[PDB]
Enzyme design. Structure first.
Site, PDB file in Angstrom:
ATOM      1  N   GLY A 281      37.543  58.766  31.246  1.00 20.65           N
ATOM      2  CA  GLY A 281      36.630  57.739  30.765  1.00 20.65           C
ATOM      3  C   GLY A 281      37.187  57.328  29.422  1.00 20.65           C
ATOM      4  O   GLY A 281      37.160  58.102  28.455  1.00 20.65           O
ATOM      5  N   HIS A 282      37.759  56.134  29.378  1.00 16.10           N
ATOM      6  CA  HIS A 282      38.371  55.617  28.168  1.00 16.10           C
ATOM      7  C   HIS A 282      37.450  54.534  27.624  1.00 16.10           C
ATOM      8  O   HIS A 282      36.579  54.027  28.352  1.00 16.10           O
ATOM      9  CB  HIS A 282      39.773  55.085  28.483  1.00 16.10           C
ATOM     10  CG  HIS A 282      40.715  56.140  29.002  1.00 16.10           C
ATOM     11  ND1 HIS A 282      41.894  55.838  29.654  1.00 16.10           N
ATOM     12  CD2 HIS A 282      40.661  57.492  28.946  1.00 16.10           C
ATOM     13  CE1 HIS A 282      42.528  56.955  29.968  1.00 16.10           C
ATOM     14  NE2 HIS A 282      41.799  57.974  29.550  1.00 16.10           N
TER      15      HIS A 282
HETATM   16  N1  LIG Z   1      35.170  56.441  14.653  1.00 21.32           N
HETATM   17  C1  LIG Z   1      36.147  56.251  15.541  1.00 21.32           C
HETATM   18  N2  LIG Z   1      35.978  56.124  16.898  1.00 21.32           N
HETATM   19  C2  LIG Z   1      37.146  56.001  17.601  1.00 21.32           C
HETATM   20  C3  LIG Z   1      38.408  56.016  17.067  1.00 21.32           C
HETATM   21  N3  LIG Z   1      39.395  55.888  18.114  1.00 21.32           N
HETATM   22  C4  LIG Z   1      38.666  55.797  19.208  1.00 21.32           C
HETATM   23  N4  LIG Z   1      37.302  55.851  19.002  1.00 21.32           N
HETATM   24  C5  LIG Z   1      36.292  55.853  19.959  1.00 21.32           C
HETATM   25  O1  LIG Z   1      36.221  57.252  20.354  1.00 21.32           O
HETATM   26  C6  LIG Z   1      36.226  57.400  21.779  1.00 21.32           C
HETATM   27  C7  LIG Z   1      37.533  57.960  22.188  1.00 21.32           C
HETATM   28  O2  LIG Z   1      37.348  58.764  23.307  1.00 21.32           O
HETATM   29  P1  LIG Z   1      37.572  58.245  24.793  1.00 21.32           P
HETATM   30  O3  LIG Z   1      36.830  56.945  24.898  1.00 21.32           O
HETATM   31  O4  LIG Z   1      37.238  59.394  25.678  1.00 21.32           O
HETATM   32  O5  LIG Z   1      39.200  58.133  24.648  1.00 21.32           O
HETATM   33  P2  LIG Z   1      40.254  58.809  25.675  1.00 21.32           P
HETATM   34  O6  LIG Z   1      41.014  59.853  24.989  1.00 21.32           O
HETATM   35  O7  LIG Z   1      41.175  57.742  26.016  1.00 21.32           O
HETATM   36  O8  LIG Z   1      39.375  59.226  26.793  1.00 21.32           O
HETATM   37  C8  LIG Z   1      35.717  56.085  22.288  1.00 21.32           C
HETATM   38  O9  LIG Z   1      34.393  56.341  21.792  1.00 21.32           O
HETATM   39  C9  LIG Z   1      36.534  55.161  21.353  1.00 21.32           C
HETATM   40  O10 LIG Z   1      36.123  53.850  21.233  1.00 21.32           O
HETATM   41  C10 LIG Z   1      38.552  56.150  15.644  1.00 21.32           C
HETATM   42  O11 LIG Z   1      39.527  56.245  14.900  1.00 21.32           O
HETATM   43  N5  LIG Z   1      37.374  56.236  14.953  1.00 21.32           N
HETATM   44  O1  LIG Z   2      38.845  62.626  31.210  1.00 22.08           O
HETATM   45  C1  LIG Z   2      38.363  63.730  30.942  1.00 22.08           C
HETATM   46  N1  LIG Z   2      38.023  64.024  29.616  1.00 22.08           N
HETATM   47  C2  LIG Z   2      37.661  65.258  29.153  1.00 22.08           C
HETATM   48  N2  LIG Z   2      37.592  66.248  30.034  1.00 22.08           N
HETATM   49  C3  LIG Z   2      37.852  66.042  31.293  1.00 22.08           C
HETATM   50  C4  LIG Z   2      38.229  64.867  31.838  1.00 22.08           C
HETATM   51  N3  LIG Z   2      38.428  64.991  33.245  1.00 22.08           N
HETATM   52  C5  LIG Z   2      38.162  66.252  33.414  1.00 22.08           C
HETATM   53  N4  LIG Z   2      37.803  66.963  32.286  1.00 22.08           N
HETATM   54  C6  LIG Z   2      37.403  68.305  32.211  1.00 22.08           C
HETATM   55  O2  LIG Z   2      38.140  69.235  33.125  1.00 22.08           O
HETATM   56  C7  LIG Z   2      37.253  70.143  33.899  1.00 22.08           C
HETATM   57  C8  LIG Z   2      37.431  69.799  35.326  1.00 22.08           C
HETATM   58  O3  LIG Z   2      37.177  68.403  35.520  1.00 22.08           O
HETATM   59  P1  LIG Z   2      37.772  67.629  36.796  1.00 22.08           P
HETATM   60  O4  LIG Z   2      39.029  66.810  36.190  1.00 22.08           O
HETATM   61  O5  LIG Z   2      36.744  66.643  37.219  1.00 22.08           O
HETATM   62  O6  LIG Z   2      38.259  68.649  37.751  1.00 22.08           O
HETATM   63  C9  LIG Z   2      35.912  69.910  33.272  1.00 22.08           C
HETATM   64  O7  LIG Z   2      35.784  70.751  32.106  1.00 22.08           O
HETATM   65  C10 LIG Z   2      35.986  68.477  32.783  1.00 22.08           C
HETATM   66  O8  LIG Z   2      35.080  68.166  31.763  1.00 22.08           O
HETATM   67  O1  LIG Z   3      35.658  60.170  28.819  1.00 21.82           O
HETATM   68  C1  LIG Z   3      35.811  61.114  29.552  1.00 21.82           C
HETATM   69  N1  LIG Z   3      34.905  62.208  29.521  1.00 21.82           N
HETATM   70  O2  LIG Z   3      34.796  62.887  28.291  1.00 21.82           O
HETATM   71  C2  LIG Z   3      34.895  63.117  30.691  1.00 21.82           C
HETATM   72  C3  LIG Z   3      33.494  63.589  31.060  1.00 21.82           C
HETATM   73  O3  LIG Z   3      32.517  62.814  30.903  1.00 21.82           O
HETATM   74  O4  LIG Z   3      33.381  64.748  31.540  1.00 21.82           O
HETATM   75 MG   LIG Z   4      37.398  60.454  27.988  1.00 19.52          MG
END
Ligand SMILES: Nc1nc2c(ncn2[C@@H]2O[C@H](COP(=O)(O)OP(=O)(O)O)[C@@H](O)[C@H]2O)c(=O)[nH]1
Ligand SMILES: O=c1[nH]cnc2c1ncn2[C@@H]1O[C@H](COP(=O)(O)O)[C@@H](O)[C@H]1O
Ligand SMILES: O=CN(O)CC(=O)O
Ligand SMILES: [Mg+2]
Ligand SMILES: Nc1nc2c(ncn2[C@@H]2O[C@H](COP(=O)(O)OP(=O)(O)O)[C@@H](O)[C@H]2O)c(=O)[nH]1
Ligand SMILES: O=c1[nH]cnc2c1ncn2[C@@H]1O[C@H](COP(=O)(O)O)[C@@H](O)[C@H]1O
Ligand SMILES: O=CN(O)CC(=O)O
Ligand SMILES: [Mg+2]
Lengths: 431, 431
Positions: free
Chosen positions: B40-41
């Site tokens: 989830g990005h």
């Molecule tokens: N305050 C803050 N939020 C950020 C920054 N970079 C990313 N985010 C936000 O932090 C989150 C990053 O985690 P996620 O969305 O899971 O990124 P992923 O690593 O690609 O999954 C989202 O809420 C982004 O919009 C930053 O420098 N500062």
């Molecule tokens: O995109 C992700 N972000 C953070 N943790 C993840 C993500 N996908 C899986 N995990 C973690 O990995 C474990 C297994 O998740 P699964 O990838 O759905 O098998 C759990 O602890 C999840 O929260």
């Molecule tokens: O953005 C990705 N997540 O943190 C994974 C989850 O919801 O378990």
């Molecule tokens: Mg994520």
């Protein structure tokens, strides 16, 4: 380069063992990064023959430490059996082998499963070596497998084994209607060696990082072949491990950026054991020749290998997945005698469309026919020749052609099973 | 370099999405090589927010082709749902997305399984996102999974689906004593999109080889985090895909030798969702601060993330498995306000032995305590700062310390969710 990978560009049995062994004269570690004891390698020294499976191919050299990295599905029973025959020949296996605690374990329920699974397929049998590689990998990915590091705590180990074997026993008796594997037998066997295994545990990821910072020479030994790759091979007729250069990083712990030279082994002619698409397969006399002459029999199962012409289109695939730096042409000698030889240069799709790229999944190779390029053979013998000059013009031409058609230079030519029946045109290490 | 990889050095959610999106301004392709829709990005542009999962993060830029490589477990139902929301926002998803026929398919029996499996564990729940990633990977490795290329032939497809669902249905009802998944429902759903999916099929291995020979810029987008790596993460609390740099070669088809820069994303503070070893975990007020302030909630499950201090010892692990070239420090801003902050510099083993290397399997992190190094915080705000100068001495010090302790330079600092709230100290591409 300091880090040289050696792998199969085809379906395995190209000659990794021989090549790795000859090459570790200047190497500090030799690392097995994938597969298990399904691999059957054959080293021949002063005519003395050694057939390894689980144990890395550098084990006979005392200046190299052999490591089986976390990507290997390790079978204790199998390891020991191997360890002993080697140690009986005056080879101090335990003095030189280290392994990762992160190696999944192949226990009897896996073999039980592997056979049951295979039998269920019937006509669709993958034609697996029947070692339980597949199931061991499943438990792994399915986060239920037991690993080498789980022997460090036996009570804990008993609990876990308990919940995995029962799950397994269930489908074994209930679904496959086959025999259950005894929990106590497995527990006793595994526990009788637990100590032997745990004494050899090391942290391979870090070891390789040190070896690297120190500039030491490291060699990675691949099992099976490219076209057996789970992702990239002829699915579902593939092994369950990434046989390609990529297994090196996932199976050893080394960052991909530290891979220097990828030496693809090339067998001058093609073999395959097991069910699977094989475009250039010879079903005739020449097929028999290649086979008889190349003593083509499963080094692990003793089963005869399907043989055929060299498939360049497929090799071109290996070059790109693997990012090969060079080739090592093995078994050029088996070709001696043929009036003429041919190599596949394109594929004639079942829709009349001529293509130079390989299909991915098995099912897509179905009506594919190879378009050969025939060449004059050579009666002059090449067996044991250790210098280009001794090679007849027919030979050097075929060789250059292979390079031409692939764009990768042949760096080593093998011309005999013995470690010295070779020509190193370029040593991977000082490159 | 022409080939830049972007991945998580921790447990994911470090900020890949944002970074990849900002970085593909100069990129031709963006390739997702592992995982599935468990990721989830969150991209934020002019305050407009987009949360992707299966779709690569470059999708909003029209000069880049997004490719989901063979290492991704693809869910059709999930893809479509995503494809539509994007296309509704004026983003021509199908005009820009291509994918591999070699992608396994995540169908309902997988989700069924994933939950059943998880429930059986009870107290041992891995805490998975519950998307069926695990099972999809099992069928894959266990050579029974269905792939994208199997939609090209529906009658054939029906046969195969038939023998896989029944096997699955069996254990589902008989073993788990849970509900069976209907073969006809699955067949109808999958067949309603088969065409949509197959129209986007391309041969990614070869595409990347061309892109490469042509010098084009390619970016690889990693999902999850290093410590979630199936081989190298805290087994069994890991995802089932190789999250590490190595997935790039096995999941895209690119030879490891063509990986130029590995950019590890770094979150200035640590989070984890799911069961698993987390040495520096804060259970106190500061923990809450970090969380509230960092809006730390699962971008896919909406579940709160465990938070803690930056674990340098673990990061040092990421550096070596991944062969990182540089870092990208995300969320430095969340730290604004703290009187002082601390980062873990060593581990105190449960036997009193101080060590600077991480344990492998989960079970070995059990009594491990972190030895912090406390630093003065900063009240001055850093949110949205796009130039080092605007950063207080406390900030730049913490930063250099991180570099000191790791030996990898911080190349990009993120200081806000918006694509422009950033400082590119060094662009991966022109390096
Ligand atoms: N305050 C803050 N939020 C950020 C920054 N970079 C990313 N985010 C936000 O932090 C989150 C990053 O985690 P996620 O969305 O899971 O990124 P992923 O690593 O690609 O999954 C989202 O809420 C982004 O919009 C930053 O420098 N500062
Ligand atoms: O995109 C992700 N972000 C953070 N943790 C993840 C993500 N996908 C899986 N995990 C973690 O990995 C474990 C297994 O998740 P699964 O990838 O759905 O098998 C759990 O602890 C999840 O929260
Ligand atoms: O953005 C990705 N997540 O943190 C994974 C989850 O919801 O378990
Ligand atoms: Mg994520
Ligand atoms: N005639 C001949 N036999 C060779 C040559 N190189 C290796 N061999 C033998 O061919 C076999 C190679 O296959 P195998 O043992 O499966 O090697 P693997 O690829 O490492 O498994 C063994 O029989 C080797 O001793 C060569 O150039 N010429
Ligand atoms: O070392 C090997 N050499 C050649 N083929 C192998 C080897 N290991 C597995 N295969 C082939 O891969 C398929 C599955 O074998 P498995 O590795 O035992 O699962 C069968 O066709 C095997 O013959
Ligand atoms: O040497 C390895 N074999 O060819 C594998 C087998 O016997 O199936
Ligand atoms: Mg063999």
């Amino acid at each position: 380069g300091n880090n040289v990978v050696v792998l199969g560009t085809q379906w395995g049995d190209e000659g990794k063992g021989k090549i790795v062994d000859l090459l570790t004269e200047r190497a500090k570690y030799v690392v097995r990064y994938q597969g298990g004891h399904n691999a059957g390698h054959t080293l021949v020294i002063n005519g003395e023959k050694t057939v390894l499976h689980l144990i890395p191919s550098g084990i006979l050299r005392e200046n190299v430490t052999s490591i089986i990295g976390n990507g290997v599905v390790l079978s204790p029973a199998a390891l020991m059996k191997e360890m002993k025959e080697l140690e009986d020949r005056g080879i101090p296996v335990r003095e030189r082998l280290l392994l990762s605690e992160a190696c999944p374990l192949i226990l009897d329920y896996h073999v039980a499963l592997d056979n049951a699974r295979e039998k269920a397929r019937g006509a669709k049998a993958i034609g697996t070596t029947g070692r339980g590689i597949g199931p061991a990998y499943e438990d792994k990915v399915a986060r239920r497998g037991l690993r080498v590091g789980d022997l460090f705590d036996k009570e804990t180990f008993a609990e876990k084994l308990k919940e995995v074997m029962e799950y397994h026993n269930f489908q074994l008796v209930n679904y496959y209607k086959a025999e259950a594997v005894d929990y106590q037998k497995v527990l006793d066997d595994t526990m009788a060696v637990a100590d032997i295994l745990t004494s050899m545990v090391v942290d391979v990821s870090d070891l390789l990082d040190q070896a690297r910072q120190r500039g030491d020479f490291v060699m990675f030994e691949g099992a099976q072949g490219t076209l057996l790759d789970i992702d990239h091979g002829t699915y579902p007729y593939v092994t369950s491990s990434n046989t390609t250069a990529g297994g090196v990083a996932t199976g050893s712990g080394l960052g991909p950026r530290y891979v220097d030279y990828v030496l693809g082994i090339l067998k001058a002619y093609s073999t395959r054991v097991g069910a699977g698409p094989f475009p250039t397969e010879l079903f005739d006399e020449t097929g028999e020749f290649l086979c008889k002459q190349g003593n083509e029999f499963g080094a692990t199962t003793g089963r005869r290998r399907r043989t055929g012409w060299l498939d360049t289109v497929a090799v071109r695939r290996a070059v790109q997945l693997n990012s090969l730096s060079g080739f090592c042409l093995t078994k050029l000698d088996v070709l001696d005698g043929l009036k003429e030889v041919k190599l596949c240069v394109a594929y004639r799709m079942p829709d009349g469309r001529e293509v130079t790229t390989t299909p991915l999944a098995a099912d897509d190779w179905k009506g594919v026919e190879p378009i050969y390029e025939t060449m004059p053979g050579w009666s002059e013998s090449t067996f044991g020749v250790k210098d280009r000059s001794g090679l007849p013009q027919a030979a050097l031409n075929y060789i250059k052609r292979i390079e031409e058609l692939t764009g990768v230079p042949i760096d080593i030519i093998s011309t005999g099973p013995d470690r010295t029946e070779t020509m190193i045109l370029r040593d991977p290490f000082d490159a």
